[PDB]
Ligand binder design. Structure first.
Ligand code: SF4
Ligand code: SF4
Ligand code: FES
Lengths: 116, 216, 121, 688, 119, 73
């Protein structure tokens, strides 16, 4: 809140980022880029990557596979709650029935990311 | 079990210079020279750990996936203790249409690596359940989604799809909406599966430019 | 040699010839071919507005026909559809030479009509 | 040869190209696709858009690669900083006066300007001045103009001068105020006038019947064939669900190059009107909707209650080969023999395929230096074929015509107009025979209006004598060609769809049938369908043949089925289904197989592959799709074999050799239902 | 002696051992018998009698196993057995030599313009 | 309406004030009134005078949405 700078909030590459709505209504290149970015979309170059973020439940990662098109060829989603729920067989051993709900609650699981 | 809390002060650094230089530059050549029979192909590319670096991708045969993963877990310079996921990618144009992909993370030296195995539909891949305990559910999901059989698994059964579901949905030749749909029947008093009918069929928009150069 | 062809003696079926979609004056010559799709043919609807409007409600085409053409000084006019260019359409440059109150020029975005008494006439 | 292939270097890669090739063709042979706006493969080179600018070593300026010839040992660079700066600058100049029209423009989604701006241009503009505004032009009912979007590539002008031949467009004015069109209000009168909409790279010229109805990304494209004439142009049908939205040509250099006539392009709107979607049986109230079992039973009852000699089957102009062989086998299984064709000359002998096909083929005709047309109007029979004839004219092939004088958009020598002139040419009275006798590869093209004549055998004998004397057919070259104007005629001649000798005799003494099967026939003569007969009509449009019938059986159109068609050069091609069947209609051979089961004598085939195998069992060339055999030539033995048909029905030397097509825009039931074709006729009527 | 280790007959024996518990648990005592159920499961096996690869045989046996435990664990009820197993068999053996002389083509013709998709 | 109170009877010139979207109401702001503006009234859902599509049974004339014309003899 104290170091928020003034400047651009979007990357100025117009072949990836859509233009502003005033620019689109006044220049021909912006309208062409608006038309194409909202129908075909940008083309991602062929390749692969895995990128992860410290999500509040752990490591959330996407494995993106690109062939070169405007659509992902393969998009694997890695969720931390999927790995955390796999441990319930070794974590609940020696516990009682009233501790299962405590274990499930402390693993912090949401089944949207578990069940993609 | 590594990366224990040791420094009680705030650390303004990531890794050491010599080990980061070794991991970001020499790790591909190191793995190739130490265990050459395990490696059949290598790619050094845009670095899973950060946007600023490069990181290796190792191709191996299914006959040597387990010894290579044990070496990558236990060798003193490559301590890849965490297996993040196991998945597959379908390439219907190839003779072996599947690529099974393993991502690893080294908490000791802030590194990551990727390991690939190419198989077709009827060649089994050895399980990594004994090497990594998370390999169980990921191999179950890969069998569910693609039909890759993992030999030596304790209980290879489907984990995600419906109970009677035959068919592997993430293949390229499987339809997006499938073959069957579900409704309640008042006469049979049961929820019943029926062949697919759509009120509005899916509209496929073919946007791709005939001047575009990047399509591979 | 090379005798002329009489087009007036060519037969056209009367069911086909009486069903040609044509236009009123607007943005074209009056009476040229109007493009149509198949929607409404099963319900016997040959009109554009009747395909989505039901009743004696005032159509949008009847709204724009009540706004008179606007006198503009110059040879080209820029049409935004609003006082604020951010809130309107992409800018349209419309030719004004050869235009009058009876035969004005129309914006393809907004349907507003313009003419100029500046082309030596 | 003195090294007829020269070697150039494109981005340090050695490339061998033929001599006389440009820099752009050398870049294309290296696997690089150079951006372009004014260059076209079929037009002359202009060099005015400046988008194809590449760098050549030891040249300080960018060269225009479309126009610059490629020299030996030339070094071409296509990815240096000056090439990229040139491309961005030329694109910026192309976009300063262009209107912000992409939402309302019909090219949006399939625009060369949009895609080339996205790839080879910048992402910004620095232009804040007022733009140039242009009024729109009227060019008829098929071509819509929004002329503010013109980029002055002059593709339209070059097309109208070189391919269409009309030469009615030009550039008026100078500088920024240059303006494409006609100075006076005129109508584009070419039959090939829809091709210029494809040739325009922008939305300056769009298709008026198609306007504002669809975007290109929504359309499912199917590669089919065109059945509006006998050439069989290769097309692509674009559909949105059950509705066909437009028809476009596709490349085939052996058939149609890249063109398509306006009838084959714009008659698709007739598929949305007057369609048969239900079976009907005529009751005391009239025709009323019935089940398929009832309609098949009524047709079988009428076909079985009559004697075999009182049954006639007439094939239409658009019937595929599978339905025709099904009807032929069904009628012959009942003991009938009266088979007729709506396209005429049903009693023509079909013994050797070389006598009713183009032996030279369409692409092989370009190697002819002199062409003699006999009794044909190729501009109205096949405008794409006539465009290829004009292409042959432009590089030296001389044309002569024996027939009624017609506008062909190229100069020809009128030898005569009647078979008396043909006999005078064969004897030697006209000097065009000496022009044919000295030609290296002469060609003779005989039109379908000659074969429709009652004295066609004598005329064909005269043509054969002329070909024998002038060296038209010799060793290494066969220049004898017969063309057709209907899609289904050559397949019917190939399979043997013709009346028996007893049926020809019964027609000669005037026997009249009681049951008539109309396989898509709506242009039948009144001699073939008597009043008070039982009429079974199988078709897809409600027309003259369906208003008269007692049983109506709804079939498929050519956009809904995959049937075989053979063009006039002998090439087997096929349609493909772009949309499903409409309503309660069925496949056309399947109706006849079901009807043969209800009659009591089943056809021996139960699948589409099996009826195609039956066709291949009759004539084996049916199995080889998208190919043409070399037909056998039997010299004068065939003409010697049919001399009895020459002695009977003698020659008429005074009746002129004319063309039977009097209405080009309305030739069958689909084009008669098209409102666009009716507007096309009305536009030519209101100009007088 | 028996191709690919006789694994087809071993799996058939295992399913036949499993079958009366299926009949009791799904309460199919008065709907089908064990003899006709054994004949039906035998008819499921003959459809892949011409498989020339042992790995395809192993995959088919693994998939059939997973089908048999999803029937054992009540993850598909009796109506699933009705609509997927025994009525397709009874339809394939009930329509043979029908009371009408219509060919299969003419029934397909009178049904619709296109072939049926699925069951 | 004390007996059937409903928030769908709030006009759009009071909607943004009451929902804390802006600080404008007719008592301090002169809104531009279009000539086609329909006034706010209570919802008609649950009754038979609700909105229905054009292919519905409750329409004055149901539509068959065929994209072609059939031949009538
Ligand atoms: S021609 Fe039409 S679609 Fe192409 S850039 Fe111009 S306005 Fe846009
Ligand atoms: S109308 Fe089209 S083809 Fe003709 S000059 Fe303009 S851009 Fe070129
Ligand atoms: S393509 Fe060469 S200058 Fe236009």
């Amino acid at each position: 809140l104290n170091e928020m700078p003034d400047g651009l909030y979007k990357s100025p590459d117009g072949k990836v980022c859509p233009p502003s709505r005033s620019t689109m209504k006044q220049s021909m290149e912006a309208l062409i880029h608006h038309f194409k970015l909202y129908t075909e979309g940008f083309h991602v170059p062929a390749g692969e990557t895995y990128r992860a973020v410290e999500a509040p439940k752990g490591e959330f990662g996407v494995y993106l596979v690109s062939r070169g098109g405007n659509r992902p060829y393969r998009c694997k989603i890695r969720s931390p709650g999927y790995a955390h729920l796999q441990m319930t067989d070794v974590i609940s051993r020696g516990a009682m029935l009233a501790d299962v709900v405590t274990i499930i609650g402390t693993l912090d699981v949401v089944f949207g990311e578990i069940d993609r | 079990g590594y990366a224990y809390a040791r420094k009680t002060t705030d650390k303004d650094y990531i890794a050491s210079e010599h080990m980061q230089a070794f991991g970001n530059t020499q790790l591909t050549d190191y793995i190739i020279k130490t265990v050459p029979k395990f490696v059949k192909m290598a790619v050094t590319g845009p670095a899973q750990s950060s946007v600023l670096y490069q990181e290796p991708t190792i191709y191996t045969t299914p006959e040597s996936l387990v010894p290579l993963m044990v070496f990558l877990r236990d060798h003193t310079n490559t301590q890849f203790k965490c297996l993040l996921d196991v998945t597959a990618v379908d390439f219907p144009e190839r003779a072996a249409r599947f690529e099974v992909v393993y991502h690893l993370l080294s908490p000791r030296w802030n590194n990551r690596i990727r390991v690939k195995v190419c198989v077709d539909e009827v060649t089994a891949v050895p399980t990594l359940c004994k090497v990594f305990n998370t390999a169980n559910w990921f191999e179950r999901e890969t069998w569910d989604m693609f039909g890759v059989f993992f030999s030596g698994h304790p209980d290879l059964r489907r984990i995600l799809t419906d109970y009677g579901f035959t068919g592997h949905p993430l293949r390229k030749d499987f339809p997006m909406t499938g073959y069957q749909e579900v409704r309640y029947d008042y006469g049979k008093k049961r929820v019943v599966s029926e062949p697919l009918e759509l009120t509005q069929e899916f509209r496929y928009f073919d946007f791709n430019s005939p001047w575009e150069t990047l399509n591979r | 040699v090379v005798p002329t062809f009489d087009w007036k003696k060519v037969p056209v079926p009367s069911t086909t010839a009486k069903d040609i979609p044509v236009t009123v004056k607007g943005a074209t010559p009056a009476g040229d071919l109007r493009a149509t799709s198949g929607l409404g043919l099963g319900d016997g609807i040959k009109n554009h507005t009747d395909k989505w409007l039901d009743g004696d409600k005032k159509s949008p085409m009847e709204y724009i026909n009540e706004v008179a053409p606007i006198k503009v000084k110059g040879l080209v006019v820029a049409s935004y559809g609003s006082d604020d260019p951010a809130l309107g359409c992409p800018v349209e440059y419309i030719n004004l030479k050869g235009t009058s109150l009876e035969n004005p020029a129309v914006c393809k975005y907004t349907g507003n009509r313009y003419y100029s008494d500046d082309w030596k006439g | 040869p003195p090294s007829d292939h020269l070697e150039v270097f494109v981005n340090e890669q050695p490339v061998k190209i033929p001599k006389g090739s440009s820099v752009l063709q050398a870049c294309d042979a290296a696997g690089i696709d150079i951006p372009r706006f004014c260059y076209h493969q079929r037009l002359s080179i202009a060099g005015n858009c400046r988008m194809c600018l590449v760098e050549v070593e030891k040249v300080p300026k960018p060269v225009a690669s479309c126009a610059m010839p490629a020299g030996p040992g030339m070094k071409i660079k296509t990815e240096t900083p000056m090439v990229k700066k040139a491309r961005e600058g030329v694109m910026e100049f192309l976009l300063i006066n262009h209107p912000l029209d992409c939402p309302i423009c019909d090219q949006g989604g399939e625009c060369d300007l949009q895609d080339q701006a996205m790839i080879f241009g910048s992402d910004r503009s620095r232009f804040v001045e007022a733009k140039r505004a242009v009024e729109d032009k009227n060019l008829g009912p098929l071509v819509k103009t929004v002329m503010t979007r013109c980029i002055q590539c002059t593709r339209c002008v070059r097309f109208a001068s070189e391919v269409a031949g009309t030469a009615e467009l030009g550039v008026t004015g100078r500088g920024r105020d240059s303006e494409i069109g006609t100075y006076v209000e005129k109508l584009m009168g070419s039959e090939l006038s829809g091709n210029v909409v494809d040739l325009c790279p922008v939305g300056a010229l769009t298709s008026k019947p198609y306007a504002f109805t669809a975007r290109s990304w929504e359309l499912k494209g199917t590669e089919s064939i065109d059945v509006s004439d006998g050439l069989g142009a290769n097309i692509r049908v674009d559909a949105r669900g059950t509705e066909v939205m437009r028809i476009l040509p596709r490349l085939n250099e052996a058939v149609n190059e890249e063109w398509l006539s306006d009838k084959g392009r714009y008659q698709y709107d007739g598929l949305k009107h007057q369609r048969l979607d239900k079976p009907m049986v005529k009751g005391p109230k009239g025709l009323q909707v019935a089940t398929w079992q009832d309609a098949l039973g009524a047709a079988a009852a009428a076909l079985t209650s009559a004697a075999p000699g009182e049954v006639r089957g007439i094939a239409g102009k658009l019937a595929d080969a599978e339905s025709m062989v099904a009807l032929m086998d069904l009628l012959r299984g009942l003991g009938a023999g009266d088979l007729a064709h709506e396209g005429g000359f049903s009693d023509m002998p079909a013994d050797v395929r070389s006598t009713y096909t183009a032996n030279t083929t369409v692409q092989g005709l370009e190697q002819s230096d002199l062409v003699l047309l006999v009794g044909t109007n190729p501009r109205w029979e096949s405008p794409v074929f006539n465009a290829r004839l004009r292409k042959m004219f432009l590089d030296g092939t001389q044309v002569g015509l024996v027939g009624a004088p017609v506008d062909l958009t190229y100069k020809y020598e009128h030898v005569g107009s009647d078979p008396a002139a043909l006999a005078a040419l064969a004897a030697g009275q006209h000097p065009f025979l000496e022009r044919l006798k000295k030609a290296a590869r002469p060609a003779v093209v005989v039109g379908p209006g000659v074969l429709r004549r009652a004295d066609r055998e004598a005329v064909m004998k005269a043509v054969h004598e002329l070909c024998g004397k002038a060296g038209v057919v010799k060793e290494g070259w066969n220049g004898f060609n017969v063309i057709h104007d209907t899609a289904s005629r050559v397949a019917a001649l190939d399979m043997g769809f013709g009346p028996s000798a007893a049926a020809r005799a019964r027609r000669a003494q005037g026997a009249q049938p009681k049951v008539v099967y109309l396989l898509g026939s709506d242009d039948y003569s009144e001699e073939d369908v008597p009043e008070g007969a039982f009429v079974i009509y199988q078709g897809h449009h409600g027309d003259r043949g369906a208003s008269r019938a007692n049983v109506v059986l709804p079939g498929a159109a050519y956009t809904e089925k995959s049937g075989l068609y053979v063009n006039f050069e002998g090439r087997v091609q096929q349609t493909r289904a772009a949309v499903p069947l409409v309503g309660d209609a069925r496949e056309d051979w399947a109706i006849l197989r079901a009807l043969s089961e209800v009659v009591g004598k089943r056809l021996p085939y139960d699948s589409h592959a099996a009826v195609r195998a039956r066709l291949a069992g009759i004539a084996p060339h049916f199995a080889n799709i998208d190919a043409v055999q070399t037909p056998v030539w039997l010299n004068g033995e065939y003409v010697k074999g049919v001399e009895a048909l020459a002695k009977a029905a003698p020659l008429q030397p005074s009746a002129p050799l004319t063309s039977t097509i009097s209405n080009f825009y309305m030739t069958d039931a689909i084009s008669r239902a098209s409102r666009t074709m009716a507007k096309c006729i009305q536009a030519r009527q209101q100009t007088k | 002696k028996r191709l690919f280790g006789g694994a087809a007959r071993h799996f058939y024996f295992e399913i036949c051992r499993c079958l009366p518990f299926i009949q009791r648990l799904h309460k199919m005592e008065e709907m089908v018998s064990l003899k006709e159920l054994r004949a039906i499961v035998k008819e499921k096996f003959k459809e892949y009698k011409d498989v020339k690869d042992g790995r395809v045989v192993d995959l088919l046996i693994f998939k059939g196993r997973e089908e048999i435990e999803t029937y054992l664990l009540m993850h598909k009820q009796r109506h699933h057995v009705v609509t997927e197993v025994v009525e397709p068999y009874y339809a394939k053996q009930r329509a043979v030599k029908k009371v009408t002389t219509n060919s299969p083509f003419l029934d397909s013709f009178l049904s619709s313009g296109y072939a049926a998709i699925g069951v | 309406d004390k007996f059937d109170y409903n928030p769908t009877t709030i006009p759009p010139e009071w909607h943004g004030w009451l929902n804390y979207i802006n600080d404008y109401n007719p008592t301090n702001t002169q809104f531009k009134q279009p000539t086609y503006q329909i006034e706010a009234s209570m919802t008609k859902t649950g009754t038979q005078t609700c909105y229905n599509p054009k292919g519905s049974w409750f329409s004055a004339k149901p539509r068959n949405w065929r994209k072609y014309e059939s031949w009538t003899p």
